[PDB]
Amino acid sequence: HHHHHMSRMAEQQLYIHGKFVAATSGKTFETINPATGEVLATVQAAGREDVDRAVKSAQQGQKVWAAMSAMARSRILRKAVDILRERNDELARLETLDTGKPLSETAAVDIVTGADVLEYYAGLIPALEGSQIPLRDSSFVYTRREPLGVVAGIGAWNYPIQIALWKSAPALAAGNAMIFKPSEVTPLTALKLAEIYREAGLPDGVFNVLPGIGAETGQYLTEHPDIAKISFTGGVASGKKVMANSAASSLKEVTMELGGKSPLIIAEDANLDLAADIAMMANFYSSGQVCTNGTRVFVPAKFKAEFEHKILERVGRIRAGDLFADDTNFGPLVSFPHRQNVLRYIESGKSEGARLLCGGDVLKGEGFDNGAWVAPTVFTDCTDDMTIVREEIFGPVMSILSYDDEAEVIRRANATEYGLAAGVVTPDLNRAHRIIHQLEAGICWINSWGESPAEMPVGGYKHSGIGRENGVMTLQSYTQVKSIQVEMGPFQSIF
């Protein structure tokens, strides 16, 4: 299968105030198709003046948007939902080109669940209420949940348009304008989202999109004095940088969704076909590039051998290939530099004495040699001090760890600075709830993995995050509380 050269797209511009506009930075970058190594597009990088221009546009649009009725805002966000449903397949193809994730994932998950969250928040806008508190017959307090104003979202590359929707949906539903910076690795679908919002009737300026580099555009947003909140999804290290600068510049509210090393606990009474199916879904979806992945799989010592056989069987079914083929369920990694990092982790697994159950190398041959492919990889005989066990790899690398008793596995599951997700496989009522209640993670799955309903707040304990996304609480967290006391009695001064 040849004659498959794809030409590059038109140069991608910034989106400010309901239109595409040239950056004033004079700088551009390129986004690559990780399946081919070909340039997808040249993209303009927002400079400091561009960020200033976006903030003033956002301030102007926010005023229009917040003065509307609640239901007028709901109807506009619902119209964007309708367009996203209609354009699901077109957007999924673009996301696949930009990220390397199989169309079988992007057409089923990325836009579907992004729009699910926007649809959820659209319906909740009229239910955003303050409080009233009587103090005495002559005085009472009431509160308003006011927009923060202009907020910024900084996206990650593994779920580009989904992250854009999960950040912008509650921000807009709460009456804010959002300036969104997509990952420089994956800028394309965020620009499509901006056009869709405008087409749905969103006032100009309420969702502006500034592609750029993290050290530049991202920093300018975290530093801007008129941005009230930053929401960041990305790596633990970059999170530390964003959180510091948002403080050291102007005191902003913050949300951070970072990575993890999430444990999957297989109990002694688990069905091992179910356990293996869960472990597969917790490690090899999106080629292992998922923050919540269950990359430390704890198996009772007495079941380890049988569990390894069941994992080997299922790994052998994984279908790498043409990302637009229906039956493909595994893609290359997002970039060649990322593959180099994943390969360094795999080599450290080998050199530290873990047993390679399968994989451990790049894929080779016609069609794979030009993509950033890593074979699905499983290490076993792992110990808690190994680098591959302690550190997030963000590739298709499962670590299997044996354990003897429940107290032990809880200790070892929690013995980490991460705390994003966790799960248990057990048919037993008491074991399921008892174990989960003791795990130090924000997102816990019993006898499943990976579902993230719009209703369910998600985020990390410890170094895996600050704040939450989704759920009613995240609509509220994009407002700020104003307390107002009405004193109807005579005011007494002591002077």
HSE-up of 425 (CA within 13 Å, CB side)? 25
Residue pair 231/152 in contact by the 8 Å Cβ criterion: yes
| Class of residue 45 by CB neighbours under 10 A (exposed 0-12, middle 13-18, buried 19+) | buried
Residue pair 449/278 in contact by the 8 Å Cβ criterion: yes
Q: Which of 95, 291, 310, 382 is flagged as catalytic?
A: 291
Q: Please state, in angstroms and rounded to a whole number, the distance separating the CA atoms of residues 484 and 120.
A: 30
- Helix, strand or coil for residue 119? helix
Q: Please state, in angstroms and rounded to a whole number, the distance separating the CA atoms of residues 27 and 47.
A: 8
Q: Please state, in angstroms and rounded to a whole number, the distance separating the CA atoms of residues 161 and 191.
A: 9
**For residue 421, which of 264, 256, 239 has the smallest C-alpha distance?**
264
Residue 482 interacts with Cl ion (CB under 5 A): yes or no: no
Distances (CA, A) of 45 to 14, 211, 217: 8, 5, 7
Q: Which of residues 24-63 bind Na ion (CB under 5 A)?
A: 31
Number of residues lying near a second copy (CB under 8 A): 79
Q: Which of 101, 119, 167, 392 is flagged as catalytic?
A: 167
Q: How far is the CB of 41 from Na ion (least distance, A)?
A: 9
Residue 321 interacts with a second copy (CB under 8 A): yes or no: no
Closest to Cl ion by CB, 411 vs 433, is 411
Q: Which of residues 210-229 bind a second copy (CB under 8 A)?
A: 225, 228
**215 touches, from Cl ion, Na ion, a second copy, none (C-beta below 5 to 8 Å by class):** none
| Class of residue 484 by CB neighbours under 10 A (exposed 0-12, middle 13-18, buried 19+) | exposed
Residue whose Cβ sits closest to Na ion = 31
User: Going along 236-325, which residue ranges are E strands?
Assistant: 253-257, 263-266, 296-300
Other C-beta atoms lying within 10 Å of the C-beta of residue 132: 10
Q: Which of residues 200-229 bind Na ion (CB under 5 A)?
A: none
Q: Which of residues 233-262 bind a second copy (CB under 8 A)?
A: 236, 239-240, 243-244, 247-248, 250-254, 256, 258
Residue 493 interacts with a second copy (CB under 8 A): yes or no: yes
**243 touches, from a second copy, Cl ion, Na ion, none (C-beta below 5 to 8 Å by class):** a second copy
The amino acid at 375: A
Q: What are phi and psi of 395, to 5 degrees?
A: -140, -175
Options 152-160, 355-363, 404-412, 479-487: segment touching a second copy (CB under 8 A): 479-487
Q: Which of residues 296-315 bind a second copy (CB under 8 A)?
A: 314-315
**417 touches, from a second copy, Na ion, Cl ion, none (C-beta below 5 to 8 Å by class):** a second copy
Choose which of 95, 98, 119, 184 interacts with Na ion (CB under 5 A).
98
- 358 is known as an active-site residue: no
Residue 444 interacts with a second copy (CB under 8 A): yes or no: yes
- 469 is known as an active-site residue: yes
> For the CA atoms of the chain, what is the radius of gyration?
24
Residue pair 479/62 in contact by the 8 Å Cβ criterion: no
Q: Which of residues 160-189 bind Cl ion (CB under 5 A)?
A: none
- 291 is known as an active-site residue: yes
What are 83's two structure tokens?
């367009």
Q: Please state, in angstroms and rounded to a whole number, the distance separating the CA atoms of residues 91 and 88.
A: 5
**98 touches, from a second copy, Cl ion, Na ion, none (C-beta below 5 to 8 Å by class):** Na ion
Pairing of the two strands 229-233 and 150-154: parallel
Residue 280 interacts with a second copy (CB under 8 A): yes or no: yes
Closest to Cl ion by CB, 59 vs 249, is 59
Q: Which of residues 81-140 bind a second copy (CB under 8 A)?
A: 104, 133, 135, 139
What are 48's two structure tokens?
């400091």
- 382 is known as an active-site residue: no
Closest to Na ion by CB, 43 vs 46, is 43
What is the number of H-type helices and E-type strands within the chain? 16, 20
Closest to a second copy by CB, 243 vs 356, is 243
Residue pair 323/103 in contact by the 8 Å Cβ criterion: yes
Q: Which of residues 390-449 bind Cl ion (CB under 5 A)?
A: 411
**314 touches, from a second copy, Cl ion, Na ion, none (C-beta below 5 to 8 Å by class):** a second copy
**31 touches, from a second copy, Cl ion, Na ion, none (C-beta below 5 to 8 Å by class):** Na ion
Q: Which of residues 11-70 bind a second copy (CB under 8 A)?
A: none
The contact mask relative to a second copy for 136-175 (x = CB under 8 A, - = no) is ---x-x-xx-------------------------------
Q: Which of 119, 184, 216, 257 is flagged as catalytic?
A: 257
Q: Which of residues 168-187 bind Na ion (CB under 5 A)?
A: 186
Q: Please state, in angstroms and rounded to a whole number, the distance separating the CA atoms of residues 281 and 304.
A: 19
Q: What is the DSSP letter of 284?
A: S
Closest to Na ion by CB, 62 vs 186, is 186
Alpha-helical runs (H) found in 353-394 = 387-390
Q: How far is the CB of 464 from a second copy (least distance, A)?
A: 8
Distances (CA, A) of 163 to 183, 257, 395, 402: 10, 10, 19, 35
Closest to a second copy by CB, 128 vs 466, is 466
Residue whose Cβ sits closest to Cl ion = 411
> Which residues of this chain interact with Na ion, rule CB under 5 A?
31, 98, 186
Catalytically annotated residues: 167, 257, 291, 469
> Which residues of this chain interact with Cl ion, rule CB under 5 A?
411
